[PDB]
């Protein structure tokens, strides 16, 4: 057991392209959204462990001694620990709770603990919040019982854990993962650990080596949709019309692809007609997906008004709503951009101007944290 | 020689399906546009020939006893006749001519004629208003050098001619699309001659055997393109992303596939479901099209304006410009669509309610001409 407050952040998701054409064996790019999930643990005396999470404006405090007197599928046992109420985030206390027990158990007694959880990122708009969190959790949890080396053991800025810890976070992030969504694949758990660039084909994933500096606009038009209802209409146009869907798919394949080349080619030096191909890219994803019959006009606006202003965006994730991406090249004039996040706005859509391709599990010194983040956390 | 007044009258097309897929080998459905030539023929006395062009307000006399005494490559010689001065639509005087000696040569006097077209056809904006021209004249000719039947023999009420007449019309209208194109394929004189429906695929040409009543709405954005820029891009797209272009072409081609088997289903019994289909195919073909990138931003707004109101529609060409089409099917309320006519024309877009799957080749009693058509003709 370690004595000093833990601070640690992990980004969330946007897939970049590939969205429904995985579900039929297509190539996916999954990568790490820079919009943040925090968790401060703060070590404490009283024999309580208090989960707080300010977002979705609930508060858990257990007492170490009926828990620690528990004897220790399993769910079902599980709730009987704390209790069984409303809340489809109720999962979350659920998986605090598994993640706690099963990682501090080799301890001699159950530390006292109090974990502070804030996020910039939107829950259910598909960005993966829930992984981020449990990532968050397992790698604070794993350090603080020492299960895993500290970054900051030199008292650094801001730090990281090592491939062979990393992938211990990732382990444990993913049982967190099982237990409040049952069958996760495991893209949303790794995208947040390892952070960086993913890439899915059919169960199988890896890690693209090298990543530009990619800036992107997020959009949420906050649009309600069922992912089932998507897939599925997807899948019955697919049997309907095959000889028109099938290729569309593979050609959709072949963008993920090209993508995957051309990142990799940028990373070398990132030359500016490299910035064209990617939005001719989105393009082009974009067109498929309305094709698909994946669209919606809240997002089709998102794009006319982006084009607008000389930007290029595609949808992200299911379609007929959710979140949206536009890229944003280097060169832009501050102008163009900033009357695009009015015009979206305007729109009634939420906006963030931030990058993809980012960090992953991160440790960080109370001094490194933002006034925002700080107010919200202590 | 006949000598009773002549009134025949030709529709244009447009192309439902196929547009760019057709220069890479794939399927393409071109079909009769019911915005029509008219032209009608008087007999005279005077040894002139008068042919008199309205829309593009040019008016030429020739003198019989001149070309009478004419020698009767071939085209410079012809040129060396009248004249050469500007007009891109001086080669219609040149067509007018090489029409009117190689089909009245075996007439031991060449007769003194007045021509007459006015049509409902914008030029230039691929409806193929040349070829219509080249039709209705051919016909005329025919028809008055008694090349061919007299439809209006029984004096009737409409006409046409029978399929071994139609042949010798269209083979006639072609030389005359020759002379003022160079090279044509023949899709747009055998669209004007047969009208219905035809499939071309790489070179070969079919008649759809029966089409369904179709009810659309044309517009012209007046936006002005280049034909030869477009396609050029479209195989510079080719070159740059084959594994994405490839695919996407198999895909256009199979939409063109799928319409000719549903309008060929539809031709039984038009279950509404079939124009359930109709749209859906049209909306996947716009998607492509933008994906190939032949979009355009006024073509994106013919959409949403008209999806606005339940509509559906898709450019028709080159894109980038020009006209788009949009479906009516049985049942819509004469306020949607009125509404949309509003919202094109307020764009500064030329709007059109007509129909596709057009007659052919027609000689109308002066009775069966509406008011518009007489006031223009007389
Ligand atoms: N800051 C947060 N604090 C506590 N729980 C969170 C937070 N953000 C997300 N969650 C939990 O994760 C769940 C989100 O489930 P959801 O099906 O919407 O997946 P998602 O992670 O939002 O994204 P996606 O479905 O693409 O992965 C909610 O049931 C919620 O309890
Ligand atoms: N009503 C008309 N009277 C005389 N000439 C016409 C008429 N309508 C079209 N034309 C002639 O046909 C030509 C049109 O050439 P163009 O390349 O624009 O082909 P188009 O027939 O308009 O359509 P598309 O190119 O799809 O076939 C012009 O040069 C013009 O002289
Ligand atoms: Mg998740
Ligand atoms: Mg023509």
Redesign the interface.
Same mark, same amino acid.
């Given at each position: 057991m370690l004595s000093e407050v833990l601070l640690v952040s992990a980004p969330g998701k946007v897939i970049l392209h590939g969205e429904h054409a995985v579900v039929h064996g297509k190539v996916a790019l999954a990568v790490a959204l820079n919009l943040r999930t925090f968790l401060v643990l703060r070590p404490q005396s009283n024999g309580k462990v208090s989960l707080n999470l300010p977002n979705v404006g609930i508060k858990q405090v257990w007492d170490v001694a009926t828990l620690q007197l528990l004897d220790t599928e399993k769910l079902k046992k599980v709730a009987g620990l704390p209790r069984d109420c409303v809340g489809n985030e109720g999962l979350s206390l659920l998986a605090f709770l598994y993640l706690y027990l099963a990682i501090c158990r080799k301890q001699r007694t159950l530390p006292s603990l109090d974990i502070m959880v804030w996020s910039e990122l939107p829950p259910g708009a598909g960005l993966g919040s829930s992984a981020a969190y449990s990532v968050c959790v397992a790698a604070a949890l794993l350090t603080a019982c020492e299960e895993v080396t500290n970054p900051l053991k030199d008292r650094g800025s801001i730090g990281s854990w090592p491939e062979e810890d990393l992938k211990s976070i990732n382990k444990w992030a993913y049982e967190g993962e099982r237990v409040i969504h049952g069958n996760p694949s495991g893209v949303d758990n790794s995208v947040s650990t390892w952070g960086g660039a993913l890439r899915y084909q059919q169960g199988k994933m890896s890690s693209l080596k090298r990543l530009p500096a990619l800036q992107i606009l997020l959009t949420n038009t906050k649009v309600p949709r069922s992912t089932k209802a998507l897939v599925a209409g997807v899948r019955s146009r697919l049997i309907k019309?095959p000889?028109?869907?099938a290729?569309?798919l593979?050609?959709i394949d &072949?963008?993920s692809?090209?993508c995957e080349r051309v990142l990799g080619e940028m990373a070398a030096a990132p030359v500016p007609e490299q910035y064209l191909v990617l939005e001719?890219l989105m393009?082009?994803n974009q067109?498929?997906l309305?094709?698909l019959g994946v669209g919606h &006009?809240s997002l089709?606006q998102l794009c006319?008004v982006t084009?607008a202003h000389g930007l290029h965006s595609k949808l992200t994730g299911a379609g007929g709503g959710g979140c949206g991406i536009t890229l944003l090249k280097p060169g832009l004039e501050r102008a163009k951009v900033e009357a695009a996040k009015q015009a979206l706005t305007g729109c009634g859509f939420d906006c963030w101007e931030t990058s993809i391709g980012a960090p992953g599990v991160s440790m960080h010194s109370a001094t490194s944290i933002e006034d925002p983040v700080r107010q919200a956390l202590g």
């Open positions: 019309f000889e028109i869907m290729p569309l593979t050609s &072949a963008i692809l090209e001719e393009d082009m067109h498929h309305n094709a &006009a089709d006319q084009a």
